[PDB]
Design a binder for this molecule. Structure first.
Ligand code: 1IM
Length: 291
């Protein structure tokens, strides 16, 4: 049974995508809608984000939208985006999720400086808290044997009090076009976040998600101040994968961020182990970061 679409009132656009755009909507007097799937605290109207399939969508776009509903219906964790409701029995097709009022994590961290017109700062423990939450969400996806394939701060959302949820906004956003390697007729690839075996073999696993987490953790500790391997070309990043394969000590790594102690950097390096099996599981990464 659908969420009652009439209870949504459009406020503004937040973003757009390959098979739907995301609108900020208001829900008046939401108390009668509360359920195991639809939580509420309560500025008395509830704000939600709604991804909507517009009227001129291609058949291919509609199919991808309906499959995204199915994929997201799997997701049941405090640090993963969740479907509060859907409207799919008639058009327009809608996915309803929590409004994450501080937007994507990359833009959020880019707007802060590490604790030494106001001046937004973030503390080192809070950075660790951000990182721990990402690891907790990934720990959950690992239990589902669900491979994310595009973990990065651009795909994470920030709510109140530095709460984090992992999401997936796809690979077509102009804002982050430089984070993907495009060859005509091939899958688009986030190569600067990809494990060497992914670059060479095009297959993604939980272990390559762990590598991408290492790069995401590096982003967080950089406060997103620069692109991974930013002074290298896409081609050099791809060649670096070859050097991991050959294992003659000529592969290169992301450097230690200014805000990152050597002990935490050693954890990053463990995420970038040549051998998939030597990379720490997310349960271990989460324990380290939280404790
Ligand atoms: O995350 C999405 C896309 C999507 C769908 C519906 C709503 C929103 C939003 C939003 C928003 C934006 C700003 C502020 N507040 C909220 C985003 N898909 C998806 C597909 C497969 C796997 C995953 C997973 F595993 F990463 F969680 C996620």
């Amino acid at each position: 049974v659908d969420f009652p679409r009439s209870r949504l009132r459009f406020k503004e656009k937040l973003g757009e995508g390959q098979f739907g755009e995301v609108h900020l909507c208001e829900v008046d007097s939401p108390q009668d809608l509360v359920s195991l799937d639809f939580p509420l605290n309560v500025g008395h109207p509830l704000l939600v984000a709604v991804k909507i399939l517009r009227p001129d969508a291609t058949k291919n776009a509609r199919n991808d939208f309906l499959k995204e509903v199915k994929i997201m219906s799997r997701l049941k964790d405090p640090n993963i985006i969740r479907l509060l409701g859907v409207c799919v029995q008639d058009d327009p097709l809608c996915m309803i999720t929590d409004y994450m009022e501080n937007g994507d994590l990359n833009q959020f961290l880019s707007a802060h400086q590490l604790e030494d017109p106001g001046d937004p700062t973030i503390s080192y423990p809070m950075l660790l808290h951000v990182a721990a939450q990402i690891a907790s969400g990934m720990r959950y996806l690992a239990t589902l044997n669900f491979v994310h394939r595009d973990l990065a701060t651009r795909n994470c959302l920030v709510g109140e009090n530095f709460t984090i949820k992992i999401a997936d906004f796809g690979m077509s956003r102009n804002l982050y076009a430089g984070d993907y390697y495009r060859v005509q007729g091939r899958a688009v690839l986030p190569i600067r976040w990809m494990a060497w075996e992914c670059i060479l073999m095009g297959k993604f696993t939980t272990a390559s998600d762990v590598w991408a987490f290492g790069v995401t953790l590096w982003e967080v500790l950089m406060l997103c101040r620069a692109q991974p391997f930013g002074q290298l070309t896409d081609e050099q990043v791809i060649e670096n994968a070859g050097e991991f394969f050959r294992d003659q000590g000529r592969q290169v790594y992301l450097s230690r961020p200014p805000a990152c102690p050597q002990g935490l950097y050693e954890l990053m390096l463990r995420c970038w182990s040549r051998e998939s099996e030597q990379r720490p599981p997310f349960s271990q990464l989460h324990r380290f970061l939280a404790e």
